[PDB]
RNA sequence: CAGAAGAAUCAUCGAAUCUUUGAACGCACUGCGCCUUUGGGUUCUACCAAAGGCAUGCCUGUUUGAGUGUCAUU
RNA sequence: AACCAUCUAGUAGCUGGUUC
RNA sequence: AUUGGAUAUGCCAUAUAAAGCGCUUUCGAAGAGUCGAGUUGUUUGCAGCUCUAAAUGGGUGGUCAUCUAA
RNA sequence: UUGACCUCAAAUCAGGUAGGACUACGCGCUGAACAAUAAGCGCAGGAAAAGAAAAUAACCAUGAUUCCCUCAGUAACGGUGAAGCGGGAAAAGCUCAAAUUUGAAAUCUGGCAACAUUUCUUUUGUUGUCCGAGUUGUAAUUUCAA
């Protein structure tokens, strides 16, 4: 099984060039197994499905990372490159605008803030 | 100021000036939709004291309801359904005739940044104010369910409270 | 239809000649634009940032609350009311308040024209409170014209129900 | 009906509807970019009128020319709004920040290589030369006319320095000059300086758009030629010399049979079109002198006896000198076209002018 | 049972993926489409395939055009 | 007219039963 | 590893500013198809319908007290 | 006429937002039978609602709301059935409209350009500039306790 470590230090075109070679290989084993396949064929399929998944991950990981870099310091970015969390969290007041106060209130907390004190018994 | 003159003129609702304007505008409002957007309030004194500011995020809507529940409560709810993305702030009476009562409803956009950055109307952005008119939290809604302070206005008396040591 | 006298008076506006002469004086006293105000303030900012007392400004007064307060203070020499305010009850008392305070007033056409003087889309009422010594005679001649072409004219017509 | 030849071509109204641009804007975009009508083989089938390929319309959908045109129109409306409202400062400030456009992308798309632009610059050179002498009118631009004249002067100076001119013919319409630059052959027509008048029959907007595109192509070609030859782009221009009608003398070529008349000092009086004669002499490597009436900055004078040939179309020479026998421009034009010096006696003043053979005619 | 030797039918878990529907949203509810872009191809103008999109109400703004409008307009 | 779910543990002076 | 309120300290600080207290030969705006009245329904409150206000006024209480709605 | 303003529309225009589900508790509307009853319908949150007196009292006076105990099975009513005081838990107060900034709309959204910042390349802002909103009124100031 190819490791993700050396699957992440090559370009996409050759990385996509590894996609179809694994695709027909998986397809070929299915042809062999329906005409008589040993236990290795079941594993060789099982190994190659995860192997196809591993390289598909690094294609999608790198493609998104390319999109994230391209849409850095942009005001509006695609919905895919955005936080999800929950729907209500995305609608709540941001911490900045929850901290907004009128200039009347700023003068209250500047001249008369809650003091730190103690009572001697 | 001019809102002192506007608000004392609004007490003489059947005077010559007010009666002519009531009948002229009632005909005009009937040619429009049942619920239609108002470019500016027809009572700038009354909207202003009910929380309306002439700024982005504040919307005035007119609605006519049939005469013959509370008329003002239904106007708030119908407009709230029509503009589902806005929060109903308040509402008031603008006009009436033999058949229809006309109301203007003040709505606030909880998603506009001019609302979310204004601490004086920042409270309406919180989810607890979703459809205030639907839960009887507006001015007329609170009055409808007899909310107030005084002798003029159940579960804790239909239950047996059995303590541990009794 | 039949209209009350307080609303009927707005159909009798100032004549074209007197209104054109009125706006010649008004256009001398336009408020400075947002750009001109910024240029004047940044110019004084450099004189402060590096290292360094004026006269009172002159402009036409605008705003409904502002102008009504100036009439009540008897500070306004000339009040020009728009003829087509969308809710008429906004200015329906202004001719009566100007009569009570002895303020020369006129009803001019195109509230948009009033707004153009003040670099705004729209103005309900303009008021000239006090002008430079050079324009004392020009304002005085206008006030006399408004007396004849608006107050002496109509007057008996403004107390009659219009329309019908 | 919905497929085949009908979809092959797009009608002018259909193409405008797809591009969402007005007829004038579409014409300007078509003139600025590369778009020509394409008549389908089956006109009846193509209509399911002018016909254009859908590929050109598809490319023109994302063209920034339409967006720039809207910005100019939108800004023009705002400038008109400020003038009407009475705030002159806002309109004056907004005038400086008015929108503009760049033709670098269009030139690269239309001409991927400099060879294609040079081969297609024959029309641009002719348009620039024709507009270099036209009077300033409301439809035309005074700055555009000055830019076209400067571009033509720079091209003439570059050709003279590189000796790229090959043939020069004197025609009724004007002077036809054939030059070889980077292998490509460029032909330009320079109209004579006469008191012409506006025909008031052609479209000025289309001509101005074509002239603007031609000027941009000429400027890009001149910059590339100057960089290749080491000349400074744009060349230095003397204001005092320009006001004195010095011609190419103002444009200094500062560095950043090509010798048919090299050993000759031609002199021209105020009776012949010295604008083309000086360029031909400069392209041949020789020295050309002009009278003070024709212009200032002349290296030589009339009284100077160093001039070997004196070009003068006048039939009388009261102040004729020795060693400066009068010659006619026909001999110079024939010599330039043929590459061999003609007979000065045959084309002497007061003699029959030999027929002028067109070098382009084979 | 089988299968791999950083293995595990493991745990944690911030990254990716997540078929058709469903508030379900191109129209329909099986199919029929629209626009745009991209590409095929040995069939290259086009066609075809795929992708991107294409619900409604309402709020803020942008752009465009109408008006029976108010004027401005010697 | 029918069917289904809940109110419902609805209503009983009466019936049967009610544990070494 | 991610965070919160403090402490210490460096830098910056648009203070020509902004506040509390004190004093008066000067002033002091207060929410209407609402309150309220009649009448008809729902469960006094609320709702409809007809009418429709005031300015030491108005509300609720025992001349007085208390409160200051829309 | 140009041109401003007001409209009335349009756009597969940019940025947003609503629906459905859960529903023990919560807030409205509606409603029979044997009671704000079940149902039916509408709408939320981690709590909700209520809430800084158009409140009690008749005292040497109390002092927003909510919950618990008590008052009390009392007054009153016609079996239903509170509340003031009193004792506890917890405590926090405030914001507008109505005033001329008038010696200067001092206010705000957005586009664009940089600079930051992050639960986060996903987040959230700052500065500059232009446009728009706004004088039919956005800031500062004031809320009767003044």
UniProtKB/Swiss-Prot annotation, chain A:
PROSITE patterns reported in the protein's UniProt record: RIBOSOMAL_L29
Cellular component GO terms held in the UniProt record: cytosol; cytosolic large ribosomal subunit; nucleolus; preribosome
InterPro entries per record: Ribosomal_uL29, Ribosomal_uL29_CS, Ribosomal_uL29_euk, Ribosomal_uL29_sf
Pfam families documented for this protein: Ribosomal_L29
Keywords assigned: Cytoplasm, Nucleus, Phosphoprotein, Ribonucleoprotein, Ribosomal protein
Subcellular location(s) per record: Cytoplasm; Nucleus, Nucleolus
One term of GO molecular function: structural constituent of ribosome
SUPFAM superfamilies: Ribosomal protein L29 (L29p)
List of residues that carry Phosphoserine: 11
A Gene Ontology BP annotation from the UniProt entry: maturation of LSU-rRNA from tricistronic rRNA transcript (SSU-rRNA, 5.8S rRNA, LSU-rRNA)
Complex formation: Component of the large ribosomal subunit (LSU). Mature yeast ribosomes consist of a small (40S) and a large (60S) subunit. The 40S small subunit contains 1 molecule of ribosomal RNA (18S rRNA) and at least 33 different proteins. The large 60S subunit contains 3 rRNA molecules (25S, 5.8S and 5S rRNA) and at least 46 different proteins. uL29 is associated with the polypeptide exit tunnel.
Family: Belongs to the universal ribosomal protein uL29 family.
Descriptive protein name: Large ribosomal subunit protein uL29
Protein species of origin: Schizosaccharomyces pombe (strain 972 / ATCC 24843)
Gene expressing this chain: rpl35
From Swiss-Prot, chain B:
Record SUPFAM superfamilies: Ribosomal proteins S24e, L23 and L15e
Chain intervals for the UniProt region annotation (Disordered): 134-153
Biological processes annotated in GO: cytoplasmic translation
Compartments where found: Cytoplasm; Nucleus; Nucleus, Nucleolus
NCBIfam families associated with the record: PRK04243.1
Role this protein plays: Component of the ribosome, a large ribonucleoprotein complex responsible for the synthesis of proteins in the cell. The small ribosomal subunit (SSU) binds messenger RNAs (mRNAs) and translates the encoded message by selecting cognate aminoacyl-transfer RNA (tRNA) molecules. The large subunit (LSU) contains the ribosomal catalytic site termed the peptidyl transferase center (PTC), which catalyzes the formation of peptide bonds, thereby polymerizing the amino acids delivered by tRNAs into a polypeptide chain.
Protein name, UniProt field: Large ribosomal subunit protein eL15A
Gene source species: Schizosaccharomyces pombe (strain 972 / ATCC 24843)
Swiss-Prot record, chain C:
Compartments it resides in: Cytoplasm
Gene Ontology CC, one term: cytosolic large ribosomal subunit
Record's keyword terms, sorted: Cytoplasm, Phosphoprotein, Ribonucleoprotein, Ribosomal protein
Keyword Manganese attached: no
Key word Transcription regulation present: no
Any one Gene Ontology BP term: cytoplasmic translation
Free-text function comment from the UniProt entry: Component of the ribosome, a large ribonucleoprotein complex responsible for the synthesis of proteins in the cell. The small ribosomal subunit (SSU) binds messenger RNAs (mRNAs) and translates the encoded message by selecting cognate aminoacyl-transfer RNA (tRNA) molecules. The large subunit (LSU) contains the ribosomal catalytic site termed the peptidyl transferase center (PTC), which catalyzes the formation of peptide bonds, thereby polymerizing the amino acids delivered by tRNAs into a polypeptide chain.
Assembly mode: Component of the large ribosomal subunit (LSU). Mature yeast ribosomes consist of a small (40S) and a large (60S) subunit. The 40S small subunit contains 1 molecule of ribosomal RNA (18S rRNA) and at least 33 different proteins. The large 60S subunit contains 3 rRNA molecules (25S, 5.8S and 5S rRNA) and at least 46 different proteins.
Protein family (similarity comment): Belongs to the eukaryotic ribosomal protein eL8 family.
Listed name of the protein: Large ribosomal subunit protein eL8
Gene name in the database record: rpl8
Full-length numbering of the shown residues: 69 to 236 of 259
UniProtKB/Swiss-Prot annotation, chain D:
Single GO cellular component term: nucleoplasm
Record field: transmembrane: none
The keyword Cell wall biogenesis/degradation appears for this protein: no
Biological processes, Gene Ontology terms: assembly of large subunit precursor of preribosome; maturation of 5.8S rRNA from tricistronic rRNA transcript (SSU-rRNA, 5.8S rRNA, LSU-rRNA); maturation of LSU-rRNA from tricistronic rRNA transcript (SSU-rRNA, 5.8S rRNA, LSU-rRNA)
Source organism, top-level taxon: Eukaryota
Example of a GO MF term: ribonucleoprotein complex binding
Alphabetic keyword roster: Coiled coil, Nucleus, Ribosome biogenesis, rRNA processing
Function: Component of the NOP7 complex, which is required for maturation of the 25S and 5.8S ribosomal RNAs and formation of the 60S ribosome.
Name recorded for this polypeptide: Pescadillo homolog
Residues of the full protein shown: 8 to 454 of 607
